[PDB]
C-alpha cells in the first residue's frame, strides 16, 4: 500500500521491497541540534514507520546557528518539544513523538539508534546494549569544520545489494567446450572476477539453461570463462547471460573494541595520515568536555588549546598509538570545537540519514566503520581570525562566528546572490543561506527564479513546501518559507516566475547581472545549465553547479580567470536506439516502449496538429506541398481525421481502437513475415531470425485477455478525448460493441508518370474549405506522465506489452513503463542535502576570494558504496596569440559599434590577423567565400545595422551589447583561435 503518488521519485532508487521493509522500522534520535534536526527531517521524508526525539536541554540562542525549526521566541523551552510540532508536518505517514527520559531497555523498541551531541561514556553505555541486542547504532559528531561518523549494525549484518546497480545482462555469440563465453561484436559485459551469472536460451548447450549461477573468470573485455562444460555439450550458439547478485555478510565491531583498533574510511586519498589524528582528537575533545562540566574549548583560546593537546598526548600514550601527533591540526580542532555550521550539519545529516536507510532496508554497502571528514580549506585567510573576533555576540550566528569571525560574518551579510531554480537543491540552498545570514545586511539581496508549480510528487524531497501549497509557484512559497525561518530576510528576497533563457534577457539584463556576487544553479537540464554558464562567463561571475542522479552527486565551482567553464566539460549523453531496431526488429522492452511513445505521438498528437493548422493558416496546403517531407501523409491524416473517420459517438471510437489494434499488432507482423519468412537465411547462410533479431508472431484479438482490453480502453478513451466525446469505462459496452465487428480481409502484397501530383490535388480538394468549418477545433493530446487519469501511460504500457508479446519479450508493468517513457530522473533527499552542503562549503571559499586553484575542490560522491572524492578544478587553458598569453575562456575583445570594414582593419593592424568568419547568434554575418557583391553591400554598414538586416528583427531597447564569434587565419593561412568580441552598442 505504498503511496506511489508521493514516493514516485524515491521508489526508482530504493524499490518496493526496500520501502516495504523500511515502513516497519523505528528510529530513535538522541540530540536535536542542527545535525539531529537535519537527520530527523531526512528520515521523516524517507518514510520510516516513526521517529522519536530525545533532547531535554533548554534552547539557547546560539543553537539557532544551524536549527531552522527554532525561533528566538523559543528560548528556555526544551528543543525536542518545540521541534516535534514542526517535524510532524513534513510527512503525514510518519508520526513523530518525544520521550522525556531514556532507559536502556526502552532502546529495544527501535530498529535504529542515532546518537549526536553526547559524551563518550554515554555512547559506550548505549552501544554496549545496542550491540548485543542486534540494534543498528549510528553516532555522528560535528565540530566546526570537522565531522565524524561511526556505524555499527551488529556482528551478522546481511547486505543483499552491495552496489545498487542493475544486474548485468548481455548476449552471447559462441560458447566453447572449455567454458569460454564470448559476447557479440563490440559488446563489453562489464563483469568482474568473482561474479555469478546464469545462462538462458542457449542453443546447443541446454545444461547451461538450468539457472544455477556459475563463477566468472575475466579473460578480456569481450570474453570470460565459467570453468568446464565438457559434460553438458561441445559448442553452444547464441543465448543471453544475466548476472545474479548474492547476499553478503558484513561483521562490525562494538564501539569499545573499535576505539583501540578502528577501521577507517578515507574520504580523500591526498591526506591519508589525518584520520588517525582525528581519532585521538575527538576522544580528547570528549575527555576535555568531561573534565570541564561539558564545556568545550573556547574559540581561538591558547590555554584551552594547550590543555586539549595535553589530553591528546595522554590518550595517544594510553592507546599505544604509534603515530606522531600533528600539533597544528590538533590545535585547529581545538579552536573550532564550539563551531556549528549549517553546511557541515547538512552534509553529515544527509550521510547519516543514508546510513539509517541502509540499516533499516539492509541495502547498499555501509560505512565500515569510522568516517572522518574535514573541509579545512574553507577557513578564511583574508580576515583576522582571533579570540577577540570569534567571541560570541549573543546573536543567533554565534555557531558560525566561532569559526569564521565577525568580519567574515559581515562579508556574508552583504552578499548579492542569484539562485536559478527552486527545486530540492534550490530549497536546501535557500535554507542554508537563511541560516548563514546571507544578504541580511544593508547592501544584501537574494533573487530566486523558477516558473514551475508545486506538484504532489515534489513534496517528498522539497521540505519547504506543504500539501496546502500544491499548485502554486515554487519561488514565492520558498521565499515565504525562508523569510519565516529567518525574520531578518523580510524584504531582502525577490522571487520571479521567469524561465531563464534567451527570451528572459529583458529582465536578467546587464543592470541585473552587474550587481550580483555569485550565481548558483539548481537546474535539472543541460541546456539551461549551458545558458547560465555562458551568461556567467560573459559577465565574469562565480558559478556553483550541482547535480544529482539517484544516490550519486557532483558539485563544481567556476571561478573567473582561474578555472574552466561548465561548457568545457562533457558528460555521456543519452543513447538513442537505431531506427531499424525500433521499427522492425526489437529485442528489449525499451525498444517497445520507445515504439509505443512514437505511436502515441503519431496517432493522437501530430494528426490533430495538422488538422488544426489546416483550419487556421489560409495557405497551409501550398506550404506543406513544397515544405513538408511527406505531403501525402499530411493530406491523408487531414482527410481521415476530418471526414473519413470522424466519430459521432463513443462506439465508433471503440471500433476505431479495435481497427488500430488489428492494424498495428496483426497485419504489419504478417507483412514482415511475408517479406522475411522464419526460415529465411542471410547472405552468409546463417539463419536470418537469430541473435538480436527475434521471429515475431501475429496476435489474435481476444477480448477476455487483460492486455487487449486495456489497449482497447486506452485507445478509445484517448480518441474520445481528441474528438471531445463522452468516454465510458464499463466493460459491458465494450464487450457488446466489439462482438459485432467484422475484420476486413488482409493478405500481404508482394508488389510486382506525374499523376502523383494529380492524386494529391484530388485528395486536397476533397477536404472541406476552411471557411465552411469555423470554430471547429480538435484537442491535441499533450503527453503528461504525472497525471493518472488521462490514459497516457496506460496506453503506452498496453502498446509496449502487446509488442513485447509479439516478439516473446518480457512485458513490463506500469511502474517501469512510467520510469522509461517519462524520462524520470531518480532523486533522493539525502543526496540533495549532501550536494547542498558541499556547495555551501564552496560558497565560503568564493566569498573569501581565494586566488589559488588548489584551494577549491570539485566534489563527487556515490552514497551506494560510501564513496567521496574531491579534486582540484581544471585550470582554464592558455594560448599564444600575437606572441601574447591569452586565456581561452575568460578573455574577450572590447570594441565600439564600428563598421565591419573598420573591425576587419582593426584586427589586421592591431592583432596582425586576417578575419575569415564572423558570426553572431545563429547567423553568419561575414565569411571569406561569399560573393563580392554581398560583401560590398554589407561592408560599409555598422555591426548593429548588419545584425538587424541579417536577422530581420530590430534590436530591442534593452539590448546593450553583442557577442560575436570570429575565426581568423594568420599571415601564412594557419588557423589560430581568438577570443570572442564584445561589441558595445
Amino acid at each position: 500500500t505504498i503511496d506511489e503518488g508521493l514516493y514516485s521519485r524515491q521508489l526508482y532508487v530504493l524499490g518496493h521491497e526496500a520501502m516495504k521493509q523500511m515502513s516497519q522500522s523505528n528510529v530513535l534520535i538522541i540530540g536535536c541540534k542542527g545535525l539531529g534536526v537535519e537527520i530527523a527531517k531526512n528520515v521523516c521524508l524517507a518514510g520510516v514507520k516513526s521517529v522519536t526525539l530525545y533532547d531535554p536541554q533548554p534552547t539557547r540562542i546560539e543553537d539557532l546557528s544551524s536549527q531552522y525549526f527554532l525561533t528566538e521566541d523559543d528560548i528556555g523551552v526544551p528543543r525536542a518539544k518545540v521541534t516535534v510540532s514542526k517535524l510532524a508536518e513534513l510527512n503525514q505517514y510518519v508520526p513523530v513523538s518525544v520521550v522525556d527520559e531514556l532507559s536502556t531497555e526502552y532502546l529495544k523498541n527501535f530498529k535504529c539508534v542515532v546518537v549526536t551531541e553526547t559524551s563518550l561514556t554515554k555512547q559506550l553505555e548505549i552501544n554496549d546494549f545496542t550491540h548485543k541486542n542486534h540494534i543498528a547504532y549510528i553516532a555522528a559528531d560535528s565540530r566546526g569544520l570537522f565531522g565524524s561518523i561511526f556505524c555499527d549494525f551488529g556482528e551478522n549484518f546481511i547486505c543483499t545489494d552491495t552496489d545498487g546497480n542493475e544486474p548485468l545482462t548481455g548476449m552471447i555469440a559462441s560458447i566453447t567446450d572449455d567454458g569460454v563465453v564470448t559476447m557479440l561484436e563490440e559488446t563489453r559485459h562489464g563483469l568482474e572476477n568473482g561474479d555469478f551469472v546464469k545462462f538462458t536460451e542457449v542453443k546447443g548447450m541446454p545444461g547451461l539453461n538450468d539457472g544455477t549461477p556459475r563463477k566468472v573468470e575475466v579473460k578480456g573485455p569481450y570474453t570470460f570463462s565459467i570453468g568446464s562444460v565438457k559434460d553438458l555439450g561441445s559448442a553452444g550458439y547464441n543465448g543471453v547471460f544475466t548476472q545474479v547478485k548474492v547476499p553478503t555478510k558484513i561483521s562490525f565491531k562494538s564501539l569499545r573494541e573499535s576505539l583501540k583498533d578502528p577501521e577507517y574510511v578515507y574520504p580523500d586519498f591526498g591526506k591519508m595520515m589525518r584520520p588517525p589524528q582525528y581519532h585521538i582528537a575527538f576522544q580528547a575533545l570528549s575527555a576535555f568536555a568531561d573534565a570541564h562540566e561539558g564545556s568545550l574549548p573556547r574559540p581561538r583560546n591558547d590555554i584551552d588549546a594547550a590543555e586539549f593537546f595535553e589530553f591528546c598526548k595522554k590518550i595517544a600514550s594510553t592507546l599505544q598509538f604509534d603515530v606522531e601527533l600533528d600539533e597544528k591540526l590538533i590545535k585547529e580542532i581545538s579552536y573550532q570545537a564550539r563551531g556549528d555550521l549549517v553546511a557541515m550539519s547538512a552534509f553529515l545529516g544527509g550521510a547519516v540519514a543514508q546510513e539509517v536507510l541502509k540499516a533499516t532496508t539492509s541495502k547498499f554497502y555501509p560505512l565500515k566503520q569510522y568516517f572522518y571528514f574535514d573541509s579545512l580549506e574553507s577557513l578564511p585567510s583574508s580576515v583576522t581570525i582571533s579570540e577577540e573576533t570569534c567571541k560570541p555576540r549573543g546573536c543567533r550566528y554565534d555557531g558560525q562566528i566561532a569559526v569564521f569571525g565577525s568580519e567574515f560574518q559581515e562579508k556574508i551579510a552583504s552578499l548579492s546572490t542569484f539562485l536559478v531554480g527552486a527545486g530540492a537543491i534550490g530549497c536546501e540552498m535557500l535554507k542554508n543561506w537563511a541560516m548563514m545570514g546571507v544578504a541580511t545586511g544593508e547592501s544584501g539581496h537574494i533573487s530566486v527564479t523558477d516558473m514551475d508549480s508545486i506538484e504532489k510528487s515534489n513534496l517528498n524531497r522539497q521540505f519547504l513546501f506543504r500539501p496546502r501549497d500544491v499548485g502554486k509557484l515554487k519561488s514565492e512559497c520558498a521565499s515565504t518559507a525562508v523569510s519565516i525561518m529567518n525574520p531578518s530576510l523580510t524584504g531582502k528576497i525577490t522571487s520571479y516566475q521567469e524561465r531563464v533563457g534567451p527570451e528572459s534577457e529583458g529582465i536578467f539584463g546587464d543592470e541585473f547581472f552587474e550587481k550580483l556576487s555569485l550565481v548558483t544553479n539548481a537546474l535539472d537540464n543541460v541546456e539551461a545549465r549551458m545558458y547560465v554558464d555562458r551568461r556567467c562567463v560573459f559577465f565574469e561571475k562565480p558559478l556553483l553547479e550541482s547535480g544529482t542522479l539517484g544516490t550519486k552527486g557532483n558539485t563544481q565551482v567556476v571561478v573567473p580567470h582561474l578555472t574552466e567553464s561548465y561548457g568545457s566539460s562533457q558528460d555521456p549523453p543519452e543513447k538513442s536506439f537505431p531506427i531499424c531496431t525500433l521499427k522492425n526488429f526489437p529485442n528489449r522492452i525499451e525498444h517497445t516502449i520507445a515504439w509505443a511513445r512514437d505511436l502515441f505521438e503519431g496517432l493522437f498528437k501530430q494528426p490533430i496538429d495538422n488538422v488544426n493548422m489546416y483550419l487556421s493558416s489560409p495557405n497551409f496546403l501550398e506550404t506543406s506541398l513544397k515544405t513538408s517531407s511527406n505531403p501525402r501523409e499530411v493530406l491523408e491524416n487531414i482527410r481521415d481525421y476530418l471526414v473519413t473517420e470522424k466519430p459521432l459517438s463513443f462506439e465508433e471510437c471503440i471500433m476505431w481502437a479495435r481497427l488500430q489494434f488489428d492494424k498495428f499488432f496483426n497485419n504489419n507482423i504478417q507483412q514482415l513475415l511475408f517479406n522475411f519468412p522464419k526460415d529465411s537465411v542471410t547472405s552468409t547462410g546463417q539463419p536470418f531470425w537469430s541473435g538480436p533479431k527475434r521471429a515475431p508472431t501475429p496476435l489474435s484479438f481476444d477480448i477476455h485477455n487483460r492486455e487487449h482490453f486495456d489497449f482497447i480502453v486506452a485507445a478509445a478513451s484517448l480518441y474520445a478525448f481528441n474528438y471531445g466525446l463522452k468516454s465510458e469505462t464499463d466493460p459491458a459496452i465494450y464487450e457488446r460493441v466489439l462482438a459485432g465487428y467484422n475484420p476486413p480481409p488482409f493478405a500481404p502484397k508482394s508488389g510486382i508518370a506525374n499523376k502523383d501530383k494529380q492524386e494529391l490535388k484530388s485528395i486536397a480538394d476533397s477536404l472541406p474549405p476552411p471557411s465552411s468549418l469555423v470554430g471547429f477545433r480538435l484537442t491535441p493530446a499533450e503527453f503528461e506522465k504525472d497525471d493518472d487519469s488521462n490514459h497516457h501511460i496506460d496506453f503506452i504500457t498496453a502498446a509496449s506489452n502487446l509488442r513485447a508479446m509479439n516478439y516473446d519479450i518480457t512485458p513490463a508493468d506500469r511502474f517501469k513503463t512510467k520510469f522509461v517513457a517519462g524520462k524520470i530522473v531518480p532523486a533522493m533527499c539525502t543526496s540533495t542535502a549532501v550536494v547542498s552542503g558541499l556547495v555551501c562549503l564552496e560558497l565560503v571559499k568564493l566569498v573569501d576570494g581565494k586566488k589559488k586553484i588548489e584551494e577549491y575542490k570539485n566534489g563527487f560522491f556515490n552514497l551506494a558504496i560510501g564513496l567521496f572524492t574531491f579534486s582540484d578544478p581544471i585550470a582554464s587553458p592558455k594560448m599564444k596569440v600575437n606572441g601574447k598569453e591569452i586565456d581561452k575562456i575568460w578573455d574577450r575583445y572590447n570594441l565600439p559599434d564600428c563598421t565591419l570594414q573598420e573591425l576587419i582593419d582593426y584586427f589586421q593592424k592591431e592583432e596582425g590577423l586576417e578575419v575569415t568568419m564572423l558570426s553572431s547568434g545563429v547567423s553568419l554575418l561575414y565569411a571569406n567565400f561569399q560573393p563580392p557583391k554581398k560583401l560590398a553591400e554589407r561592408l560599409p554598414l555598422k555591426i548593429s545595422e548588419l545584425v538587424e538586416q541579417i536577422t530581420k528583427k530590430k534590436l530591442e531597447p534593452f539590448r546593450k551589447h553583442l557577442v560575436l564569434e570570429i575565426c581568423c587565419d594568420d599571415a601564412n593561412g594557419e588557423d589560430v583561435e581568438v577570443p570572442f568580441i564584445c561589441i558595445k552598442l
Binding site: 543541460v526 541546456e527 562533457q570 549523453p573 543513447k575 538513442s576 536506439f577 537505431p578 531506427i579 531499424c580 521499427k583 522492425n584 526488429f585 517531407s629 511527406n630 507483412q671 514482415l672 517479406n675 522475411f676 542471410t682 547472405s683 536470418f688 508488389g751 575569415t916 568568419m917 558570426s919 545563429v922 547567423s923 553568419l924 554575418l925 565569411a927 567565400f929 541579417i950 564569434e965 575565426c967 588557423d975 583561435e977
Partner: protein, 147 residues
C-alpha cells in the same frame, strides 16, 4: 557550435569533395542543404540527391539530423528520407566531420545492407530478384534524381 560548424565548412571549401557540396541555407549555420552525386558503379548513376542537415544546438556533442529529400529506392532509406547509419543514432562521437558522413552515405549507396534493412519489401526484392531491384532503382533515380 558555430566555430566547429565553420571549421567543417572551411575544410569542405578548401578541400573539394568532388562528389558532394554542402552549404548553409541562406545565412543560417544550423541548417545545411548538401548534395550527393550518384556512384558510377551503382544503379543510381547520373543522379543528384539533396540532403537536409540540421545541426543540434549541442553540436558536436550530439549527432546531426541528416534526411534525404530526393526520393530514392534503397533498402536502407524509407519514404521519409531517414538514413540507417550507425554514426547518426548512438555511435556518434565528437570526432566525425560532415565529409565523413557524406562519404559514409556514398558508400552505403555503393552497396546496400539488406541483412539489417529499414524497408523490408525493397530488401526482399533485392535478395530474391536482383534484376527487378535494378530496374526499379534505375526508374526511380531517373524519375526523381534527374531534373
Amino acid at each position: 557550435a558555430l566555430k566547429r560548424i565553420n571549421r567543417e565548412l572551411a575544410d569542405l571549401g578548401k578541400d573539394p569533395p568532388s562528389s558532394s557540396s554542402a552549404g548553409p541555407v541562406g545565412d543560417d549555420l544550423f541548417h545545411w542543404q548538401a548534395t550527393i552525386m550518384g556512384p558510377a558503379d551503382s544503379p543510381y548513376a547520373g543522379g543528384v540527391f539533396f540532403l537536409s542537415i540540421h545541426f543540434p544546438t549541442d553540436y558536436p556533442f550530439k549527432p546531426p539530423k541528416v534526411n534525404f529529400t530526393t526520393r530514392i529506392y534503397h533498402p536502407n532509406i524509407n519514404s521519409n528520407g531517414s538514413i540507417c547509419l550507425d554514426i547518426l543514432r548512438d555511435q556518434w562521437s565528437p570526432a566525425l566531420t560532415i565529409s565523413k558522413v557524406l562519404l559514409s552515405i556514398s558508400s552505403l549507396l555503393t552497396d546496400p545492407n539488406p541483412d539489417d534493412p529499414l524497408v523490408p519489401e525493397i530488401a526482399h526484392v533485392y535478395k530474391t530478384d536482383r534484376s527487378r531491384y535494378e530496374l526499379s532503382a534505375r526508374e526511380w533515380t531517373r524519375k526523381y534524381a534527374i531534373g
